[PDB]
Amino acid sequence: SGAIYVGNYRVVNRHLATHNDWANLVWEDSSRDLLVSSTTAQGCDTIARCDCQTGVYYCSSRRKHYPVSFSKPSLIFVEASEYYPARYQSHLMLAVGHSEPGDCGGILRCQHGVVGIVSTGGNGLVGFADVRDLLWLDE
Numbered sequence: 385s386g387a388i389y390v391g392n393y394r395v396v397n398r399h400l401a402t403h404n405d406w407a408n409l410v411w412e413d414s415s416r417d418l419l420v421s422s423t424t425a426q427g428c429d430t431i432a433r434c435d436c437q438t439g440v441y442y443c444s445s446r447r448k449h450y451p452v453s454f455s456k457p458s459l460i461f462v463e464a465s466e467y468y469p470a471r472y473q474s475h476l477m478l479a480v481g482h483s484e485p486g487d488c489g490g491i492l493r494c495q496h497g498v499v500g501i502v503s504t505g506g507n508g509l510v511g512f513a514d515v516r517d518l519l520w521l522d523e
């Protein structure tokens with residue numbers, strides 16, 4: 385679990401969005417596993433606007449932060465799950481690191497701010513949904 389809170393927006397994994405997220409929907413994209421909903425309170429986070437390929441992510445299944453080298457946002461095949469059919473997930477970045485299904489929503493940060501959130505994993509890999517191209521989150 386986990387979310388990014390920036391301005392009057394809450395960014396979550398689309399497959400973990402609640403009834404309240406859908407009732408206050410701003411934007412969602414099944415191909416990216418992202419959903420953004422509106423909030424009444426001002427958020428605590430700031431978004432990176434950079435091309436960093438190194439950062440640190442929070443892994444809830446280890447209660448620890450780990451440093452990672454991650455690939456550029458790209459179209460990657462993701463096997464079928466209870467949440468989606470077999471498809472290409474876009475804007476996904478992979479890295480070597482530990483992740484379990486419940487780790488989705490953990491934040492990946494670089495020195496400039498929030499880069500993305502955990503969205504996929506398995507096999508000693510961890511995949512992050514990028515949010516750096518969503519410029520409208522800042523206004």
Ligand SMILES: Cn1cnc2c(NC(=O)N3CCC[C@H](C(N)=O)C3)cccc21
Nearest residue numbers: 417462465467483484485503504505506
């Ligand atoms: C070990 N392991 C297996 N599975 C994992 C997982 N879940 C995972 O990849 N998917 C299920 C939830 C939706 C994800 C999507 N974006 O399509 C795909 C996350 C993290 C570690 C995982």
Ligand SMILES: [Zn+2]
Nearest residue numbers: 434436494496
């Ligand atoms: Zn950066």
